[PDB]
Design an enzyme around this catalytic site. Structure first.
Site, PDB file in Angstrom:
ATOM      1  N   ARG A 190       0.819  -1.230   0.000  1.00 43.22           N
ATOM      2  CA  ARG A 190       0.000   0.000   0.000  1.00 43.22           C
ATOM      3  C   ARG A 190       0.841   1.263   0.000  1.00 43.22           C
ATOM      4  NH1 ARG A 190      -2.191  -0.260   4.694  1.00 43.22           N
ATOM      5  NH2 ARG A 190      -3.034  -2.425   4.374  1.00 43.22           N
ATOM      6  N   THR A 191       1.928   1.282   0.764  1.00 42.61           N
ATOM      7  CA  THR A 191       2.803   2.437   0.729  1.00 42.61           C
ATOM      8  C   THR A 191       3.649   2.393  -0.538  1.00 42.61           C
ATOM      9  OG1 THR A 191       2.896   2.970   3.050  1.00 42.61           O
ATOM     10  CG2 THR A 191       4.876   3.412   1.716  1.00 42.61           C
TER      11      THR A 191
ATOM     12  N   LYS B 222      23.589 -13.137   3.842  1.00 44.19           N
ATOM     13  CA  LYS B 222      24.559 -13.859   3.025  1.00 44.19           C
ATOM     14  C   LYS B 222      25.776 -12.997   2.604  1.00 44.19           C
ATOM     15  CE  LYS B 222      23.797 -17.307   2.468  1.00 44.19           C
ATOM     16  NZ  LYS B 222      24.385 -18.061   3.619  1.00 44.19           N
TER      17      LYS B 222
ATOM     18  N   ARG C  50      12.191   1.521   2.719  1.00 46.66           N
ATOM     19  CA  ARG C  50      11.384   1.136   3.885  1.00 46.66           C
ATOM     20  C   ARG C  50      12.237   0.134   4.657  1.00 46.66           C
ATOM     21  NH1 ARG C  50       6.240   1.557   5.718  1.00 46.66           N
ATOM     22  NH2 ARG C  50       5.156  -0.172   6.747  1.00 46.66           N
TER      23      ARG C  50
ATOM     24  N   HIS D 183       8.293   7.606  10.012  1.00 44.87           N
ATOM     25  CA  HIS D 183       7.504   7.334   8.835  1.00 44.87           C
ATOM     26  C   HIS D 183       7.109   8.716   8.334  1.00 44.87           C
ATOM     27  CE1 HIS D 183       4.668   5.558   6.073  1.00 44.87           C
ATOM     28  NE2 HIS D 183       4.067   4.690   6.867  1.00 44.87           N
TER      29      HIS D 183
END
Ligand SMILES: [Zn+2]
Ligand SMILES: [Zn+2]
EC number: 2.1.3.2
Lengths: 153, 310, 310, 153, 310, 310
Positions: free
Chosen positions: E54-55, E84, E105, E134
């Site tokens: 959604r974002t 890794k 994000r 945010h």
């Protein structure tokens, strides 16, 4: 002993003394072996004018004497360094660091897949001197590396 | 008390030729006359932290053969506690209270050794630690080798495959270089040679070990052909293919071998050992495979039991 | 017949002080003289719908200690039937035919209670239902507490940690507020207080429970320091860190405690209980941890057996 | 500033003497800021008798001069310590540990989800003093924490 | 050079008041006369290490509405590396040599903060960063309170649900506090309480607030009703239940809220605002969504540009 | 019609010398005056059957810098089909009816080679193909050695790490050997040895090389230090350790390397080049990354176009 020069300098009481410690490995010993944690007066002398033998670190451990076991422990970090027992302001016993059999909990098995890494156990290796170059055998994983390898850890 | 009473069975190195010989002598007696209630009332936990089904069905089949009760786990599906968070220390500590003994298998090396510390005074037996040890195999290995040539000396053991990594060729080598006159020929890829330190201790005894490029470079002069598995990962597939048949043993190759020559291999084989070999009289794997039930029994018998008046 | 014969062992609330005391008296006798064939021939299924390895190795180790045979399952890897589609009702119904008893553990609450309905007349014992009950722990809890101060009254029990959610501090509280003069001090985060309803029933008895911010606020005046685990999830990591050492118990803190003061904790600890504590004589966890084998035995003994002529 | 004239205290011509540190902090410092990580003449006297503080830790260091900065960092642990800058056997003047508004590279964000943890980046702490404690904000996860919790054990 | 030029939008505090208006002033303009070519040739990396569809969609749609190309991905566990080998520091350093704006994000607090010190001269917009910040969401929320109401100073803003762990509330409350007159009504469960920090600051700035039992007592008083999802996960099934019924907003309750009264929610609504709500004009959480397309547009548009007839 | 027109860039050998310069000549031009509209209306399929985020981003960013649209995906296990029916031959045949250039990556050697015989008249660029090739990366590496140094003939190129399985080394070494004068220093563990093929050819072409114990002996001698990640996975934890310390590059070691001396690495660096290295101008592995955006730009730009004032 006393790095005298031309002024008033302090000495200890009845303790073990370690000089001609390859410069830069004194703090390491101090930290590593943990002789620092005491209520007994300690005095140290890092980077000292050893002129021919460049510089040295030095640990005047007051009112405490080290068991010839511990003495040995030094060997990889300060081999040629001397530990003189000084009772009543004088060297009662000049003591030199020999190589032991096992090295307890100051070392790190470079083995990632070992078990010694994740748990409540104390590192222990077997010292197998070969052509005067050391190998260290981990008592857990049973892998044997050299001294140089486990000394980077 | 019998030498190995209450002892820990962790690493092969930690058993001397006299030792091996007891368990070897014992398992053997066991083979003939069972004592189905020898460890009755006793309880052993099986702790296969890294599940090896047959090895478990083996320790467990030995466990049940002397009438011993069994509790335990295996391949912690995913996040079973005693993994992250809970240290195997605290986890040996707790089982050490309920159980009379402990057989375990584990991913990291030395695990068993550590176990020994918090084990309390409850016996532990490593049945698979890391790329370190796996004694129990070795035992059923020589219990098998001895059963085919009544001696652990004067032997020309061929050890093909991935010598380098395999954790059973090294010990079996070790074990065998404790008995006399053992000639070891080493059939292996440049990329998977012996792990030297095995070699050095070998030369230190002053034992014979002629390196070999092909099996047919020993084929005649051999008794125990020990064949292990080479693995994909540790070698590019094209390289895997490159060799592939370079160390696979066919039965045609067995037109050369001695009467009493027996081919062994911990199992499982798949690409290495062909089925025509299965049928020929030198095939013995499934036999070393059922023999370990007795090598297994024994160890369990000598450790939980005081005097072995078998 | 012995009071708890054929009964169901589901919730602590459902056992009275006389009860606890029987099983408490029994387990104890058991501890000394075993009866390794008491439940011989009997078969109990273990139904760990939500696997708790040690708890299983415990019921199972008790099961095998009286020579009882055992069938069962654990952590349904993924889609084992009797999960979706198949109702646990129909699934208790079927096992109730083959087995002589049933010990189970389960995710949803009351599961055991329900089990009791279709159980037929085959005993069931909850060994972990939801955030509801876990009696068996409580038993080995006080069997341990009693073993250290020969009385379940006149006690100042310290119950640190996540009191709120932990499903064992509430019952142990319950259990303890059935014997007399029990002073309970509650060491807990604002964010993890006691669950009042426990409190109210506590005041309803008229029992003492001084709330505490620090362990050193009771440290001297204590016997059974019961320490539980606080969990990440139920508290932001920064908040976790915020407190972190606010309720971790070190051994230095034990320079204050009484002679007979013993620290208990269901296990496992990890961040809460330090190892210097392991060595000091107040460390008893692994001891309460092996004690439950006997509290466990007992319950199993009294339920499958008529008269307990121990 | 203590004269035991039986084992008199040695005087360095110039450098930096860090006198008056409560016990067990001195060494903690040797590492925390890296004072041995120099080839200079350093002097470590530990657990010294000072009636005003029982055991005092003491750190003389030849010809080195800490800026107003390194002084200010000491704040967190050795707050009573006095840095007396020396030159030509006498003191050019004393110095006290002013409490800073930031503490870099030496602490670790208590936050277990602070990225700073698995990355090549120094801990940096904004430091505001308040009521009965110092509070320090991470530069990364951004959370405020007490000094009591950040610099613990 | 506009202010927000070349500046990384890392967190709400490094944005002043003037700052937010210049962000709010822009979007109001691009919602009127949009510039579809204003960011052409611009490639933007949309790096979603934590998955947030959604974002992500709003962010990438926003880029597209201004002319940029977009490249990116979702989850490290859905990336090439992570554990890794590759480090954050190094991925950013690399990526920071293709694109002109990294918008990322993250599952950890600070990744944004840190990337800004690796990205080189590339500005870095924070789509998320653990329990931390945010920016865009909030920058948006304000822009939606500004639009609906016409003002950002002097409001009757009431927050509701999980005030405690609520990442979006703590962000909105700090931004609103940058403005004057506002009063904040707090109506959340005793456990999911607005943290003390916000509070303490709320009163450093001497801002009017007060805690409340329900929205009953304030329904009219308020202008803006920022709703938030509570969490069974945060509570316990049984816990969740007893209070959840204390914080559901029915259309009935809007009953007599001012004509200007609006309802907000970061979405996904799921119990709280019940469906009958949506038909009331007070419903505006979707209208709020369609706004982040301008919220975010403004940012990107300001960050990379210098001059604008906007 | 330029040479590389309509030709599938499948592997390094089918690229001559002239060939590589025309690729190197281009990018040097597009790094100076970029053509943002030169591939408009062009849709390109970015088909990553094996996941490679870092190569994917460069590749798609490269397309975007020239005007193409992009469509694609990652992993067959993240595709619609694979083992469930669809064949490679058929996916390509289909896809080969939408887009104008398939750029793919693959878990198997040859997928690229094969797709070129299914794609119809669509050119097919190899982003990867098992242990086999990787054109773009290498085309790039050269372009980065050409830029840093100014030349591709007569160099002191030393390779380091896993020479053996090293897919990128074998590619760079063959391309460099297309040029004259170069000498190659080889410093890798005895096991992770440069394969014999390269060697054998190295001497067909009578090219100067030599094996070395460490980078100590060559640090100055060299101009370019192509580093490569070794692998514990390739070795064994204990094995990995004893040699890993033999191949880490500290900033200290660059100690006295020529002013022109550069350090390269296909990334992800992870132990080898330690962080103190990056501050030295000799550090150029990130600078190398930002170049593939031109490396790859050139290719795409040449493949689909015919004439260019480039
Ligand atoms: Zn080890
Ligand atoms: Zn932080």
């Amino acid at each position: 002993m006393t790095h005298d020069n031309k002024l008033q300098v302090e000495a200890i009481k009845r303790g073990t003394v370690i000089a001609h410690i390859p410069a830069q490995i004194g703090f390491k010993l101090l930290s590593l072996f943990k002789l620092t944690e005491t209520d007994q007066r300690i005095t140290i002398g890092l980077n000292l004018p050893s002129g021919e033998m460049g510089r040295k670190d030095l640990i005047k451990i007051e009112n405490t004497f080290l068991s010839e076991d511990q003495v040995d422990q030094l060997a990889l970090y300060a081999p040629q360094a001397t530990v003189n027992r000084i009772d009543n302001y004088e060297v009662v016993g000049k003591s030199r660091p020999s190589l032991p059999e096992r090295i307890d909990n100051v070392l790190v098995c470079p083995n990632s897949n070992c078990i010694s890494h994740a748990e409540p156990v104390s590192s222990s290796f077997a010292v197998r001197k070969r052509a005067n170059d050391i190998a260290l055998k981990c008592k857990y994983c049973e892998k044997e590396f050299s001294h140089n390898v486990v000394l980077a850890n | 008390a019998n030498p190995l009473y209450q002892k820990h069975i962790i690493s092969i190195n930690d058993l001397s030729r006299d030792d091996l010989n007891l368990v070897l002598a014992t398992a053997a007696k066991l083979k003939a006359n069972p004592q189905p209630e020898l460890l009755k009332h006793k309880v052993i936990a099986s702790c296969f932290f890294e599940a090896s089904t047959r090895t478990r069905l083996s320790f467990e089949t030995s466990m049940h053969r002397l009438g011993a009760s069994v509790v335990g786990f295996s391949d912690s599906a995913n996040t079973s506690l005693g993994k992250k968070g809970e240290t195997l220390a605290d986890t040996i500590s707790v089982i050490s209270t309920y159980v009379d003994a402990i057989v375990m298998r584990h991913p990291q090396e030395g695990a068993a050794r550590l176990a020994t510390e918090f084990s309390g005074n409850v016996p532990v037996l490593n049945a698979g630690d890391g790329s370190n040890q796996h004694p129990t195999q070795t035992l059923l290995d020589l219990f098998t080798i001895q059963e085919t040539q009544g001696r652990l000396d004067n032997l020309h053991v061929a050890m093909v495959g991935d010598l380098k990594y395999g954790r059973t060729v090294h010990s079996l080598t070790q074990a065998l270089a404790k008995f006399d006159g053992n000639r070891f020929y080493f059939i292996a890829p440049d990329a998977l040679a012996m792990p030297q330190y095995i070699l050095d201790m070998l030369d230190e005894k002053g034992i014979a070990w002629s390196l070999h490029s092909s099996i047919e470079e020993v084929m005649a002069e051999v008794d125990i052909l020990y064949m292990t598995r080479v693995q994909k990962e540790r070698l590019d597939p094209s390289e895997y293919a490159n060799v592939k048949a370079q160390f696979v043993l066919r039965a045609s190759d067995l037109h050369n071998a001695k009467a009493n020559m027996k081919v062994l291999h911990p199992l499982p084989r798949v690409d290495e050992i062909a089925t025509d070999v299965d049928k020929t009289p030198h095939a013995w794997y499934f036999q070393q495979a059922g023999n370990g039930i007795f090598a297994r029994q024994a160890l369990l018998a000598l450790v939980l039991n005081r005097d072995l008046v078998l």
